[PDB]
Every structure is written in structure tokens, then in C-alpha cells.
């Protein structure tokens, strides 16, 4: 019933799902997609999907599972549990570690944040399909352009009704519920974050403009390593601090044939 | 007089040498000094599909532990800023690191390792 | 304090700057005193590399190799130099270098007479006076090329194909003038 799986070490991806209801396999389902942790320099990014059958859509409105910016962490946890005791509500989470965000964006081939965000979304929609969920309608909340995202998802799912809209959380109840899952999972992920580094608290929201975050960032600068894995190296906030406070690093991106082929030469010094 | 061209090494320090963990990075780090490798690097090393997985500066590094070939011994020598040099540590193997993937079989480091074997035959006394 | 990563022969004295037999310039060698053995220092340098030695970083990414050398190559450098000058001299007058004063070490090598037999015409009543012989040298180099060709196949590097490769490898120990005579031979 609780997100206990978030207690173990994360260096890549961490998938969490509710058991698929019996109803969800037969009746046609409606799916909602939302995210938490897109903007912070610190911590993971969580993507969530929430599904329920078409007849029990009004029954989803019956419980006050609507999204709100005012909602407390405890207030969201009560609505999440209220979904868990519901015989028809299903859900699936994807907790992308700051290291996975860093490594993807800072790779040899640039895997952009928006592609990685959209690919995680399709992956959960596909996961549901593979799990016997009869998804016939998909509702997605977007931060930017809905036209391209909707066209993308239609090519990925040509037999499913795809609706991508800005502020879809305030408009559709499935998207509101998915939003509660993402926020709860994000809060719980940053709360009990198992940390890979052998050194050890208050950082704030994790956002770049946050004074506590930039204070924590400046404090945790190491000249050789730069920052611990909890920081998103790809973010311009981390990069600028690194450029001024840490030591320079050079990557490939930024005499007879035998000896020349294997970078060998005679030593003139030491 | 002729000592100017020769730098002497402590023979007793070659015996007193505990194995040292050697990592060969695919990036150039301008600094030369101490580092908390055991704080950032070592506890982050993971086991993946290809080989060992770790990330340095937010970039994924994938590598394998390369063994020092039989007939060779690894020593780490230190010199100051009569001339002297001393073997501080020993090593039986070094971990090789490549960006995203383990360096190929055509990697120059792997080619250089096959030299002392050929050099032992090139320079052998003719009968 | 810069750290150096070395790959020396299993059984293993000081570091000596001697003449490079082919280049005629400086080259670092590792001389063993107790056994009177000579080694050459080769360096692995490739761009974008660094070392992590325990709790430290080494900017280089350099890998040093101390491998044995055939002393005859260096001995030839002095024998060829003296050859043009005149005729038949003792070893103390041939192995002379004001630039590289550590060439004295070559005179104290074990089994010099047996070694010099390969590349020099000698006179002396049991002295010893040596004169550089071209016929013996090319015959000795012919053996060196065959010695390496046998080693190339075993190690599987990359009959005429490997012969022209072995000549080029050995030419990194003998001056350009000698290399040309070896190919014609």
C-alpha cells in the first residue's frame, strides 16, 4: 500500500506499479499521464500513469482526488491511499534518478530532456498495454507544445484516442489522480534517498533560483569530482558553478608504424 | 660529475609496496594531487550488462579490469618538484575506463601492453 | 610530486640518459647495477587520459615500460662513429661521449668480447682493439630480422609482408644510413 521500493539505491530507473484490477482487463480504460521533478537541479524526476475503466469514470470524481497546488504532502498521501482501496483504480510510476538525467543529456549523442520525458511517458502507456490493461483513451498534461506530443503518441499508439493538453490536470480527473501519484512518489523518493557517496541535509525545493539550493550547491563543490550524484550535471546551474569552482576536464567530444599504431615512443624525461 | 645524468631508485622500497587501485580514465584532468576517490568514485561503481558502470562529471563510464601480463610487475614511482626516486606502491591490475562503452580491441593502451613480450624477443641474443 | 606508472620485468639500479642509437638524441634507460643489465624506457602517450592512483589523480595517463635492449645497438653507434675517423682503437677511445657521459657503463658489460664478435673486426694479443666491420654487421642484422619475424608470427601482429615490417622495426635502433644498406642486402 505504501511506496517502500523507494528505500533501495537508484543510479538509473525505478519502476513501481499497483496490481492490475480485474475490471481493467475487460472494460475499455481511460489513462492519465503527469510528471514531478522536471525543473530541480537536485533529485529525481517522476512520471506517473493512473488508469480506470470507462463506466467508473464518474466514480473517480466521487472521491476528491482532484489536483491542487495548495495540497499538503500528507493531504496527497491520503488521496493516494483512497485510490489504493478502490477496486478499479490502477497506477504505474517511473522514478528517473538525477544520474540517469545527467548521463542521458551529457552522453556522446545528446538525448534531450524532452525526448527522455516523452519516452518515459510512452513506456508507461506501453507497460499498461503489456500488463493486460484495455487502454482505449489516453490523456496527457504537457508543459509546452501539445500538437507535436499528440502526433508523436498517435504514431506510437495508432489505435488509441490520444489527448494532449496544457493544464490537463485541472481539466481531466484521470490526469489529476496521476499528478497525486507523481508528487507523492517524488516527495517519498527525495525523503528516503539512499545515497551512493561516502559523505554526509537542508537544500530547499531543489529549484535553481532557490537561495537554499544555490547555497547547498556552492557548499558541496569538490574540485575533481564536482558534485555528488544527487545533482543534475546537465543543468546550466550546475555547469556554471563547475566552470568557476571545479578543475577543468577534457573529453574526446570537447618512428615506425608499430610504435605509432599503439601510441608508444622513447622516454626523454623521468 | 657523471651523477647529473643519473636518478637513483630505492631498492628497499620495491619490496615494501601494498597493492594500489589504478583506474585509467578516458578524460584529461588538469590537476595533480589528492582526491576522495573512496568517497565519490569507488562507492558508485556498479555491475552492468557490458561491464563495470560508473559516472564521472555526469558522464557514463563503462570499463573492465585489465590484468598486468605475466613477466611484468607494476610499480608506482614518485619524484620531487644527488637525484632520487622511490617505488611507493605495487599493482597486479588496473581498471580501464571508456566513455559509454568499454574501449575496443584496437585501443592503443591494449596495443602498448603487448610490447614487452615482442621487445623480449627482438632484443634476445642471436645464436 | 608527479607519480609515474611503470611496467618493469618480473624479476625486478638507476635511470640513465644515454644516446638513442637511431635518432642520435637523448633517451632514458634503466641500468641494473648488480647484474650489469640494460633496459630501455618506452612511454605510452595518448590524448584524453588520466590516472587515479588510490586517493590521487595523475593528469598524464602515461604508462611507462622498462624492457631489455640488445646492447650491440648502442655499441654500434660508437663503433660506426669511430669507423670513419681512422682505424683500430681500444674500447675506451671508441665509447666516448661528452654529451652523454654515462656511456662508461657499456665498457663494464658482462661478455663484451663475445658480443663485439658479431659486428667488429678485432686485433690484439691476450688488449683489445676494435674496428667496425660492415659485412659482419649486416650478417648480424639479417639474424635480427629473422629473430623478429619468428616473434611477429607467435604474437600475431600484422613472408615478404612481415619481412618489410621487421626491417622497419629494427630501423628504430640503427641509423638511417645503415637501414638503407640493410634493405639492399
From Swiss-Prot, chain A:
InterPro entries: RNase_H2_suA, RNase_HII/HIII, RNase_HII/HIII_dom, RNase_HII_hlx-loop-hlx_cap_dom, RNaseH-like_sf, RNaseH_sf. Changing residue 37 to S: In AGS4; strongly impairs enzyme activity but not interaction with RNASEH2B and RNASEH2C. The keyword Ion transport does not apply. It comes from the Eukaryota. It catalyses: Endonucleolytic cleavage to 5'-phosphomonoester. GO terms for molecular function: metal ion binding; RNA binding; RNA nuclease activity; RNA-DNA hybrid ribonuclease activity. One of its GO terms (biological process) is DNA replication, removal of RNA primer. Catalytic subunit of RNase HII, an endonuclease that specifically degrades the RNA of RNA:DNA hybrids. Participates in DNA replication, possibly by mediating the removal of lagging-strand Okazaki fragment RNA primers during DNA replication. Mediates the excision of single ribonucleotides from DNA:RNA duplexes. The RNase H2 complex is a heterotrimer composed of the catalytic subunit RNASEH2A and the non-catalytic subunits RNASEH2B and RNASEH2C. This is Ribonuclease H2 subunit A. It comes from Homo sapiens (Human). The gene is RNASEH2A.
UniProtKB/Swiss-Prot annotation, chain B:
The keyword Acetylation applies. It is found in: Nucleus. GO terms for biological process: mismatch repair; RNA catabolic process. Widely expressed. InterPro entries: RNase_H2_subunit_C, RNase_H2_suC. CDD domains: RNase_H2-C. Gene3D superfamilies: 2.40.128.680. The keyword DNA-binding does not apply. GO terms for cellular component: nucleus; ribonuclease H2 complex. Keywords: Acetylation, Aicardi-Goutieres syndrome, Disease variant, Nucleus, Phosphoprotein. Pfam families: RNase_H2_suC (PF08615). Its main location: nucleus. It is linked to Aicardi-Goutieres syndrome 3: A form of Aicardi-Goutieres syndrome, a genetically heterogeneous disease characterized by cerebral atrophy, leukoencephalopathy, intracranial calcifications, chronic cerebrospinal fluid (CSF) lymphocytosis, increased CSF alpha-interferon, and negative serologic investigations for common prenatal infection. Clinical features as thrombocytopenia, hepatosplenomegaly and elevated hepatic transaminases along with intermittent fever may erroneously suggest an infective process. PANTHER family: RIBONUCLEASE H2 SUBUNIT C. Non catalytic subunit of RNase H2, an endonuclease that specifically degrades the RNA of RNA:DNA hybrids. Participates in DNA replication, possibly by mediating the removal of lagging-strand Okazaki fragment RNA primers during DNA replication. Mediates the excision of single ribonucleotides from DNA:RNA duplexes. The RNase H2 complex is a heterotrimer composed of the catalytic subunit RNASEH2A and the non-catalytic subunits RNASEH2B and RNASEH2C. The T6 pseudogene located upstream of SRY on chromosome Y is derived from the transcript of this gene. Belongs to the RNase H2 subunit C family. This is Ribonuclease H2 subunit C. It comes from Homo sapiens. The gene is RNASEH2C.
Curated annotation (Swiss-Prot), chain C:
Widely expressed. Changing residue 173 to H: In AGS2; heterozygous compound with a nonsense mutation; reduces stability of the RNase complex. It comes from the Eukaryota. GO terms for cellular component: nucleoplasm; ribonuclease H2 complex. GO terms for biological process: fibroblast proliferation; gene expression; in utero embryonic development; mismatch repair; negative regulation of gene expression; positive regulation of fibroblast proliferation; regulation of DNA damage checkpoint; regulation of G2/M transition of mitotic cell cycle. Keywords: Acetylation, Aicardi-Goutieres syndrome, Disease variant, Nucleus, Phosphoprotein. Its main location: nucleus. The keyword Chaperone does not apply. The keyword Isomerase does not apply. It is found in: Nucleus. Belongs to the RNase H2 subunit B family. It is linked to Aicardi-Goutieres syndrome 2: A form of Aicardi-Goutieres syndrome, a genetically heterogeneous disease characterized by cerebral atrophy, leukoencephalopathy, intracranial calcifications, chronic cerebrospinal fluid (CSF) lymphocytosis, increased CSF alpha-interferon, and negative serologic investigations for common prenatal infection. Clinical features as thrombocytopenia, hepatosplenomegaly and elevated hepatic transaminases along with intermittent fever may erroneously suggest an infective process. The RNase H2 complex is a heterotrimer composed of the catalytic subunit RNASEH2A and the non-catalytic subunits RNASEH2B and RNASEH2C. Non catalytic subunit of RNase H2, an endonuclease that specifically degrades the RNA of RNA:DNA hybrids. Participates in DNA replication, possibly by mediating the removal of lagging-strand Okazaki fragment RNA primers during DNA replication. Mediates the excision of single ribonucleotides from DNA:RNA duplexes. This is Ribonuclease H2 subunit B. The lineage of its organism: Eukaryota, Metazoa, Chordata, Craniata, Vertebrata.
